[PDB]
Amino acid sequence: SGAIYVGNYRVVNRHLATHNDWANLVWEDSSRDLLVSSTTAQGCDTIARCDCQTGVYYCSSRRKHYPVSFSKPSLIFVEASEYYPARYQSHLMLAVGHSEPGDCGGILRCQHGVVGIVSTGGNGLVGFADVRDLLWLDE
Ligand SMILES: COc1ccc(F)cc1CC(=O)N1CCC[C@H](C(N)=O)C1
Ligand SMILES: [Zn+2]
């Protein structure tokens, strides 16, 4: 679990969104596993606007943060689950690192701020849904 709180927005994995998230929907994209809902309180997370390929992520299954090199956002094949059939997920970045399903939502951060959130993993790899292209999160 985990979310990004920026301005009047809450960014979460689409497969983990709640009833309240869907009742206050701003935007959702199944192909990216993202959903943004509105909030009454003000969020203070800074979103990075960069092309960094290094950062730190929070891994809840280990109660630890890990430094990683990650690939540029791209389409990556993702196995079927109870949330989606087998498909390509777009805007996904991979890193070598530990992850388990409950790790989804952990933030990936570089020196410029929030990069994305854990969205996939398996076999010593972890995938992050990128958020740096969502310029509207700021205005
Ligand atoms: C962090 O997730 C891990 C990690 C290790 C694992 F063996 C398995 C997973 C789960 C995973 O990748 N899923 C299930 C939930 C939806 C995801 C998606 N974005 O389509 C795909
Ligand atoms: Zn950066």
Task: Give the C-alpha separation, 29 to 14, whole Å.
Answer: 8
What separation in Å is there between the alpha carbon of 76 and the centre of ligand 2?
22
Name the DSSP letter for residue 74: E
**Catalytic annotation on 133?**
no
Query: Which listed residue (21, 59, 91, 104) is catalytic?
Result: 104
Q: What are the angstrom distances between the C-alpha of 62 and each of 66, 81, 91, 115, 118?
A: 10, 23, 26, 21, 14
Q: Which residues of 42-75 are buried (b: 16+ CB within 10 A; e: fewer)?
A: ebebebbeeebeebebbbbeeeeebebebeebee
Ligand 1 nearest-atom number relative to CA 121: 4
Are 2 and 16 in contact, with CB atoms under 8 Å apart? no
Q: Where are the beta strands (DSSP E) in the chain?
A: 4-13, 25-29, 34-44, 54-59, 64-69, 74-78, 87-96, 107-110, 113-122, 125-130
The experimental method behind these coordinates is X-ray
Q: Is 135 helix (H, G, I), strand (E, B) or coil?
A: helix
The resolution of the experimental structure, rounded to one decimal in Å, is 1.6
Evaluate: CB of 121 within 6 angstroms of ligand 1: yes
Mutate-to-test residue for ligand 1 from 32, 77, 119, 125, highest number of ligand atoms within 8 A of CB: 119
